[PDB]
Amino acid sequence: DGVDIYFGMPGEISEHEGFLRAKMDLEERRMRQINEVMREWAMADNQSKNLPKADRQALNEHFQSILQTLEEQVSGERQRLVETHATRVIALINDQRRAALEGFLAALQADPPQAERVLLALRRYLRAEQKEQRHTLRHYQHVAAVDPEKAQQMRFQVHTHLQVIEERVNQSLGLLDQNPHLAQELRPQIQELLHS
Amino acid sequence: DGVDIYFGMPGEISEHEGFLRAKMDLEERRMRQINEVMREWAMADNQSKNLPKADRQALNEHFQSILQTLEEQVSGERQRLVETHATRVIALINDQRRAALEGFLAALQADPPQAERVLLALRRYLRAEQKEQRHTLRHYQHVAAVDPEKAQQMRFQVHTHLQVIEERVNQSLGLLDQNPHLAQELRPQIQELLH
Numbered sequence: 001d002g003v004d005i006y007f008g009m010p011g012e013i014s015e016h017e018g019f020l021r022a023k024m025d026l027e028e029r030r031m032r033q034i035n036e037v038m039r040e041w042a043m044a045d046n047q048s049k050n051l052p053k054a055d056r057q058a059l060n061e062h063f064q065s066i067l068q069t070l071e072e073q074v075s076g077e078r079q080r081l082v083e084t085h086a087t088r089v090i091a092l093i094n095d096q097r098r099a100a101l102e103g104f105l106a107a108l109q110a111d112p113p114q115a116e117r118v119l120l121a122l123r124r125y126l127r128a129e130q131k132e133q134r135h136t137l138r139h140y141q142h143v144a145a146v147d148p149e150k151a152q153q154m155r156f157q158v159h160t161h162l163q164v165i166e167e168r169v170n171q172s173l174g175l176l177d178q179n180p181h182l183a184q185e186l187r188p189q190i191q192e193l194l195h196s
Numbered sequence: 197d198g199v200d201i202y203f204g205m206p207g208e209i210s211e212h213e214g215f216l217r218a219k220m221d222l223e224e225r226r227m228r229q230i231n232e233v234m235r236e237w238a239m240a241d242n243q244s245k246n247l248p249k250a251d252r253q254a255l256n257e258h259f260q261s262i263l264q265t266l267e268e269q270v271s272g273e274r275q276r277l278v279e280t281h282a283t284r285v286i287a288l289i290n291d292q293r294r295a296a297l298e299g300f301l302a303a304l305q306a307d308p309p310q311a312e313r314v315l316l317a318l319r320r321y322l323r324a325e326q327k328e329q330r331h332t333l334r335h336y337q338h339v340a341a342v343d344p345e346k347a348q349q350m351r352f353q354v355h356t357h358l359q360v361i362e363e364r365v366n367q368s369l370g371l372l373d374q375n376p377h378l379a380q381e382l383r384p385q386i387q388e389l390l391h
Contacts, residue, residue, distance in 0.1 A: 027334065027337060030337050030340075031330065031333040031334055031337055034333050034336060034337060034354075035329070035333055035358070038354065038355055038358050039358075041355060042355070042358070042359050042362075064351060067351055068348065070340075071340040071344055071347045071348065072344065074337060074340040074341050075340055075341050075342070075344050077341075078341035078342065133231075134227065137227040137230055137231055137234075138223065138227055140230060141223060141226045141227050141230060141270060142223075144226075144266070144267040144270040144271055145226075145270050145271060145273075145274040146271075146274065148267050148268065148271045151267045151270075151271075152264060152267060155260060155263055155267075156260075158234070159234055159237055159238070159259075162231075162234050162238070163238055166238070
């Protein structure tokens, strides 16, 4: 048990599919649990017809109470599943940006800087930043789609976050300006990258 | 254009994937819109560095107002998509159940009722009822996972509906009763089935 948890999911399974599969497993599990309670409650109603009012009310309370507990478990469970997935999603996006940055840095500090290697490492970096931009836009778009009130609250935060991403791209590109010749050479192509 | 709307979505495309495709399109469309506003807002901030405290506030209230509207549009749009999708899902489940019911009935009324055909039809019908049961369960399950206060108001309805389904299934199996010999030879299969 604790050992299976340690090994976690096999690398063959992506975070996304592993998340969906876990999500589906819980959906099916909760559906079963709910149906069992609903049936018990149905059987109880059939039997209870000829019992005192105070007893029928107590019986109703008993099942309503079991469902409420079940509702809270389904909700708490979904929330944990959601936070775990969102945490892993952002973590990987940060890791990819950082790894791409180290690569861009390496290509710029090569004994004799190769325009090709530098251009490719920069492309990778700029694509990592783009992914975070899209992640940021998509999250906000999502909240506005299902919860307008919360969307208005994060508005300024999104605007700022997007500027933070843009300044990083400018700061990272400034690393290329420390080499006028190289910069002038790749300018037209980089412009194409930043434009797309 | 009205023509394209008339033909609607290709039959080969299921309602589920069509829904997801439309939702994804809107997701990307709105993401681009929001980004454009965000860019304009950032640019205004830059060119508003040397302005009077009052003009900066106005400028902010401006883009925030543009976004409030955009949010409202994104919200109403999603609601429309969700509603359209949900109504179609329930209708298709009702239709398929009625179809399977007729299919089951027909196999039972065949000149020489053929066991095998009846079994498959009965299986299809039960599967159809189960799809509605699973749709009821899942809906309640979904509303609980993302809106607890509302799930509580659903309890009785769900309870009542699942009982309605179970009773229907029992009433339908009773159509077999009107065929003792048939119900006899088919007695075992229908039993292993019920589970």
